[PDB]
Enzyme design. Structure first.
Site, short mmCIF file in Angstrom:
data_model
loop_
_atom_site.label_atom_id
_atom_site.label_comp_id
_atom_site.label_asym_id
_atom_site.label_seq_id
_atom_site.Cartn_x
_atom_site.Cartn_y
_atom_site.Cartn_z
N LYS A 1 77.52 37.54 68.52
CA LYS A 1 78.44 38.44 68.65
C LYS A 1 78.08 40.11 68.47
O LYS A 1 78.51 40.84 69.40
CB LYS A 1 79.36 38.18 67.42
CG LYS A 1 80.69 39.29 67.23
CD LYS A 1 81.51 39.23 68.59
CE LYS A 1 82.75 40.30 68.49
NZ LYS A 1 81.94 41.80 68.22
N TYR B 1 81.87 38.93 81.14
CA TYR B 1 81.88 39.41 79.88
C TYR B 1 82.13 40.99 79.73
O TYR B 1 82.93 41.44 79.12
CB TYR B 1 80.19 39.26 79.39
CG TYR B 1 79.97 38.05 78.83
CD1 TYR B 1 78.57 37.62 78.84
CD2 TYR B 1 80.86 36.97 78.48
CE1 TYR B 1 78.31 36.28 78.39
CE2 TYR B 1 80.42 35.74 78.11
CZ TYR B 1 79.06 35.67 78.21
OH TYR B 1 78.79 34.05 77.75
N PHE C 1 69.99 32.83 77.87
CA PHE C 1 70.24 31.69 78.03
C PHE C 1 69.20 30.77 78.37
O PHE C 1 69.37 29.62 77.86
CB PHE C 1 71.17 31.61 79.52
CG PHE C 1 72.64 31.70 79.20
CD1 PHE C 1 73.45 33.02 79.42
CD2 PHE C 1 73.49 30.78 78.68
CE1 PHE C 1 74.83 33.04 79.16
CE2 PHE C 1 74.84 30.87 78.53
CZ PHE C 1 75.44 31.96 78.71
N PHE D 1 70.43 37.43 66.26
CA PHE D 1 70.62 36.10 67.10
C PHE D 1 69.47 35.15 67.20
O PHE D 1 69.76 33.97 66.86
CB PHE D 1 71.23 36.74 68.60
CG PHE D 1 71.26 35.70 69.39
CD1 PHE D 1 71.87 34.64 69.50
CD2 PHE D 1 70.16 35.67 70.50
CE1 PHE D 1 71.93 33.72 70.48
CE2 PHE D 1 69.75 34.82 71.22
CZ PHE D 1 70.72 33.64 71.40
N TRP E 1 84.78 31.60 82.91
CA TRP E 1 83.57 31.11 83.21
C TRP E 1 83.34 29.66 82.57
O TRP E 1 82.85 28.65 83.34
CB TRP E 1 82.43 32.08 82.99
CG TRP E 1 81.07 31.58 83.14
CD1 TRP E 1 80.29 31.72 84.54
CD2 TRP E 1 80.10 30.85 82.29
NE1 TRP E 1 79.16 31.44 84.32
CE2 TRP E 1 78.77 30.53 83.06
CE3 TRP E 1 80.16 30.53 81.03
CZ2 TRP E 1 77.62 30.22 82.66
CZ3 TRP E 1 79.04 29.93 80.30
CH2 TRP E 1 77.72 29.64 81.21
#
Ligand SMILES: C=C(C)[C@H]1CC[N@@H+]2CCC[C@H](C)[C@@]2(C)C1
Ligand SMILES: C=C(C)[C@H]1CC[N@@H+]2CCC[C@H](C)[C@@]2(C)C1
Ligand SMILES: [Mg+2]
Ligand SMILES: [Mg+2]
Ligand SMILES: [Mg+2]
Ligand SMILES: [Mg+2]
Ligand SMILES: [Mg+2]
Ligand SMILES: [Mg+2]
Lengths: 304, 304
Positions: free
Chosen positions: B168, B54, B74, B140, B295
């Site tokens: 984002k 990233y 995650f 988020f 990835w």
């Protein structure tokens, strides 16, 4: 504009040339073209050629009927772009009882007696098969001026509406008529899913090649009749990309539908459900899809 | 699945091996895994590896912060799938004051003190840039349990929602932090169109590769938290094709967003608006897009 590879091979009716002269000649004689430039553009489009690409296995003495019907529908399709939804609707609705033969035509009005004589001649050749084209045509006509054209649509909603506006059902009924291909209600029920998938291919392939023409129309013709209603601009809006970008993506989707067509037909055969008539029918649908694309690629209607 | 060509060259942070060992080891010690199978699956995912993909130009002494934050996000992302929208919301909302550092963590609850200690360490390194990540993270988190996940969405509506659910904004703020890249409000407002375009790419590329994982989740996890919310399912539904066909088509669209990224960047520079800070920023966004994809192509998180 680079179309991705396809395994569908187009076929054209053998008598395309002589039928073209015959049908173009008839409309050049009877239809009210405004001027010479319009007459030339009419011939340049090749409406009988696309019909012979749609139905390459039509019977030799029925293909001209199909050419006449699609030719007059192409001409009306263009007329509606200079009308409001209201005017367009009134225009089409007047032709529906005339198409049925329930109302006599005004002989001073070309569209009326052309429409009347056509359907009369078709019923005289094959009454049962001709009648089964009527309501699919009327369904298409009423979709052309449906106010849903001026309201927000997603891709799914558009394709569902465009199945009527692209005339999927009338094209199927006309194909069967032109081939003398009679199918039972049960047989037709079996290929419904195949029909729906074929409709999307017809719609979007046309949308891609005819976008520039329709773009120009939306800026110059009637704000309603010429409104830009197409998958190209729908996808461009949803994904926030250019129309050119949308076309490239939609082209890939069209090939996925070609793949789905083959899968569905293969399943039909494996289950022992593909009758001889159904086998001819699904092959006919493939001709429609590949024929439409070949013509769309080369017709002056879309390139100029 | 054969990805279409991309002109983007993915880059990985040089210290990926050392940082991944460090951060994985941290979570293997502090985080509560259900069994050894989950511990192995955690390492196999390579959450620090994707972080280094990233933000390949992150400063050497800041990249581990990003790795820790994305790793726990995650982990939580997966936990929420076994909860209802109400339970998931309660879970996230408790971590928000702790993230701010306003409320002390329960040291007996791993997720609480991991989050607390992380944000404390980030504010210690760079207070101003760390604080600017907070609200984008909360945005988020609150999107993850938004009721709109259980409502029918079109492609356009979905992408607007997914910009928050894909994180984002937090990725943008985290990138800037990790690079020590400071931008003015004027510079930030200047690239909103580029951000919106980039978000679509991140979302759909992820949707493509994570579909099989999320399909299984929709069948086994909670009826709300595990609900299927993806562009793959939406396009398949609207276009009436398989999920695999939808993937192939969406991938083509992703390449169109890549082209549009380059177009918008060139335009920003063709005008008088591309500052050296903005140049570093938009280049960083490209790394996010290509890195996420690279990835996603090899991680066991999606393949098994
Ligand atoms: C077969 C198609 C993709 C359509 C091409 C355009 N024309 C316009 C006139 C009426 C036809 C049924 C059609 C909509 C077919
Ligand atoms: C960068 C992406 C495509 C997303 C992959 C999934 N993860 C889940 C944890 C939190 C991240 C912001 C992200 C949503 C990023
Ligand atoms: Mg038209
Ligand atoms: Mg039309
Ligand atoms: Mg068209
Ligand atoms: Mg998620
Ligand atoms: Mg997830
Ligand atoms: Mg996903």
């Amino acid at each position: 504009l680079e179309p991705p590879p396809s395994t569908f091979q187009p076929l054209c009716h053998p008598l395309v040339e002589e039928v073209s002269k015959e049908v173009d000649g008839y409309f050049l004689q009877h239809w009210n073209f405004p001027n010479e430039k319009a007459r030339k553009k009419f011939v340049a489009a090749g409406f009988s050629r696309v019909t012979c690409l749609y139905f390459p296995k039509a019977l030799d003495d029925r293909i001209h009927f199909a050419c006449r019907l699609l030719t007059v529908l192409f001409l009306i399709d263009d007329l509606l772009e200079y009308m409001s939804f209201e005017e367009g609707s009134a225009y089409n609705e007047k032709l529906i009882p005339i198409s049925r033969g329930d109302v006599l035509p005004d002989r001073s009005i070309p569209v009326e007696y052309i429409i009347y004589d056509l359907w009369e001649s078709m019923r005289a050749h094959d009454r049962e098969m001709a009648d089964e084209i009527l309501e699919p045509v009327f369904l298409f006509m009423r979709a052309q001026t449906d106010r849903t054209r001026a309201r927000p649509m997603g891709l799914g909603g558009y394709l569902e509406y465009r199945e009527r506006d692209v005339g999927k059902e009338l094209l199927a009924a006309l194909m069967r008529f032109s081939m003398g291909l009679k199918l039972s209600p049960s047989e037709l029920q079996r290929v419904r899913e195949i029909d729906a998938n074929c409709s999307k291919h017809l719609s979007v392939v046309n949308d891609i090649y005819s976008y520039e023409k329709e773009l120009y129309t939306s800026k110059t013709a009637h704000s309603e009749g010429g409104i830009l209603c197409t998958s190209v601009q729908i996808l461009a809006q949803e994904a926030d990309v250019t129309a050119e970008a949308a076309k490239r993506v939609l082209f890939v989707m069209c090939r996925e539908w070609e793949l789905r067509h083959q899968l569905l037909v293969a399943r039909l055969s494996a289950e022992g459900l593909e009758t001889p008539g159904l086998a001819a029918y699904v092959e006919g649908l493939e001709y429609q899809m590949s024929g439409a694309e070949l013509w769309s690629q080369t017709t002056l209607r879309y390139s100029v």
